[PDB]
Design a protein around this ligand. Structure first.
Ligand SMILES: CC(=O)N[C@@H]1[C@@H](O)[C@H](O)[C@@H](CO)O[C@@H]1CP(=O)(O)OP(=O)(O)OC[C@H]1O[C@@H](n2ccc(=O)[nH]c2=O)[C@H](O)[C@@H]1O
Ligand SMILES: [Mn+2]
Length: 548
């Protein structure tokens, strides 16, 4: 007959992963004091872990109303609103929560991440500062993936990453160590939530296909942390490897499953950004663990032996900012699905383009569209009379905010065009109307840059000082397109303008993109598989492998 105790014990089930016996406890808490903000909020947290995202928000909105000053409620409400797909309302609650506890960094950082997603730039500079300070001070549980959006050095990214990795490591007891097998075929494993219609699957599929044909001595094992999505990608990946569906397994069981298969080299294709699975790596189920492709920066993690980069994206000057030992592929670090035949799109009109005019384009998640990147794109529009800027439609009112900024920047708002979300092949097809792709800084197009070039659309970029800001530049460089890697904003604006105001030169550059996309190594997955396989083998011998 004890109220406080019920919620306290309901919390103990949560914490230990007890949705069902935890709900019995919360419900009985509500049967003593019905409508009490502390229980009403808690019931909404149940529904939320049970994945009843919409009922959660209805309940958490009650509490919030019953106590608009309770910061924990304000915050919990926001998560539910977010996970219920209500972007704008979600950012309002974090805005309130931040205002209730102006100096709680944990909240500031989630606030910042949501504003960037909605292209809401109010007091952006102050929030960015507060997040970076929090990284400095070790506080805030800033997430390394979110941090990539900030203009922060490689030194700051390492701080963020390694603090985060160290907190996780302190809560985890690694599996007993093991060594790379001495003899026999190498077992190489990759952990990922994106084996299907997602960037990781999309980038790695033709590569796994080539490895299957060309590197018979390496056994590729995919550990998929997501179920089968019906995509040809997922099916092709399963056909080109041994795919283990470990969706549903906890961290410990996933790590145990990897160990069960005696994986020699384990690759994190998550990496710091997915649902996670970070403790799966903290458990050290494989003797050599490699950060590659998925997370574009250092893991900062004591459980990660290596990072796999390339000479341009991960140049020598950048090595000290990586906790891992750095390995490099001979060409670009990024593979791609060179089996794609880009289809033909609907007419320009049907894609919301004017029938005439240069179409500048930047397809990229909203959080990469920062003021600096937008402003240099708007500058090109201002200098080139009939051009247009093509963007992906973003969440909530992001599109309207960009429109207003275009106006504020002296550009007719209607010269922005927003592509709705489209299955991959239809989206890829859109590039055939694109004249020039304008990269963002400091977080480049990554998968979208690969898409553009594969279709034949040039990418203009300003290689920066962190790996995430040199990816597009690495593709350009390995393709041979160095004139498309330029020094700074002024040079980026001047280059996009020289090209857009001269349609013959722009056409010549499309023809040059086409020759180089045929000739260069960037899009030869046979040679990528050879180089990848040889690296894997050399790395395994360095750890005792005596070969097949
Ligand atoms: C792989 C990589 O280099 N970067 C990581 C990726 O590995 C990771 O798993 C993901 C998790 O956050 O973060 C970035 C993705 P990143 O590489 O940044 O790729 P994004 O720009 O997020 O691209 C999303 C994907 O959706 C496709 N698209 C987009 C819009 C549309 O309407 N239709 C469509 O098909 C694009 O081809 C792209 O492949
Ligand atoms: Mn298995």
């Amino acid at each position: 007959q004890d109220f406080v105790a019920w919620l306290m014990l309901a919390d103990a089930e949560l914490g230990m992963g007890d949705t069902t016996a935890g709900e019995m406890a919360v419900q009985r808490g509500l049967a003593l004091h019905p409508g009490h903000p502390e229980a009403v909020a808690r019931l909404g947290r149940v529904r939320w872990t049970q994945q009843r995202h919409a009922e959660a928000a209805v309940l958490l909105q009650q509490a919030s109303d019953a106590a608009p000053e309770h910061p924990g409620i304000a915050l919990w409400l926001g998560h539910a609103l977010e996970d219920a797909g209500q972007a704008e309302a979600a950012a309002a609650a974090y805005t309130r929560a931040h205002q209730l506890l102006p100096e709680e960094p944990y909240i500031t950082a989630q606030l910042l991440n949501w504003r960037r997603r909605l292209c809401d730039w109010r007091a952006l500079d102050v929030l960015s500062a507060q997040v970076r300070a929090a990284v400095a001070q070790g506080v805030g549980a800033v997430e390394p993936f979110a941090f990539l959006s900030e203009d922060a050095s490689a030194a700051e990214q390492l701080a963020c990453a390694r603090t985060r990795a160290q907190a996780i490591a302190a809560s985890v007891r690694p599996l007993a160590p093991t060594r790379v097998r001495s003899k026999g075929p190498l077992r190489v494993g990759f952990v990922s939530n994106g084996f299907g219609a997602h960037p990781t699957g999309l980038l790695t599929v033709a590569l796994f296909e080539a490895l299957q044909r060309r590197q018979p001595d390496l056994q590729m094992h995919l550990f998929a942390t997501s179920g089968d999505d019906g995509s040809t990608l997922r099916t092709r990946l399963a056909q080109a490897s041994t795919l283990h569906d470990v969706t549903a397994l906890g961290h410990l069981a996933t790590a145990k499953h990897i160990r069960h298969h005696g994986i020699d080299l384990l690759f994190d294709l998550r990496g710091w950004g997915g649902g996670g699975r970070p403790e799966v790596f903290a458990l050290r189920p494989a003797p050599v663990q490699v950060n590659w492709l998925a997370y574009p920066g250092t893991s900062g993690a004591p459980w990660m032996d290596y990072v796999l980069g390339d000479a341009f994206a991960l140049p020598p000057a950048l090595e000290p900012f990586y906790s891992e030992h750095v390995l490099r592929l001979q060409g670009a670090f990024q593979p791609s699905d060179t089996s794609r035949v880009v289809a033909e799109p609907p007419s320009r009109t049907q894609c919301g383009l004017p029938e005439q005019g240069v179409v500048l384009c930047c397809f990229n998640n909203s959080y990469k569209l920062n003021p600096q990147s937008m402003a240099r794109m708007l500058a090109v529009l201002r200098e080139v009379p009939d051009s247009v800027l093509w963007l992906l439609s973003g969440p909530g009112e992001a599109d309207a905010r960009l429109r207003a900024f275009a106006h504020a920047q002296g550009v007719d708002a209607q010269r922005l065009v927003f592509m709705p979300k489209l299955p991959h092949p239809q989206y890829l097809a859109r590039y055939r109307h694109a004249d020039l792709f304008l990269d963002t800084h400091p977080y480049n197009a990554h998968t979208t840059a690969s898409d553009a070039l594969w279709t034949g659309c040039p990418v203009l970029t300003t290689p920066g000082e962190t790996f995430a800001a040199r990816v597009a530049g690495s593709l350009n460089h390995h393709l041979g397109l160095d004139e498309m890697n330029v020094a700074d904003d002024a040079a980026f604006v001047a280059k996009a303008v020289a090209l857009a105001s001269d349609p013959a030169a722009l056409t010549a550059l499309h023809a040059r993109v086409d020759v180089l996309r045929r000739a260069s190594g960037v899009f030869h997955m046979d040679g990528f598989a050879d180089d990848f396989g040889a690296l894997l083998q050399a790395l395994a011998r360095r750890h005792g492998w005596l070969g097949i």
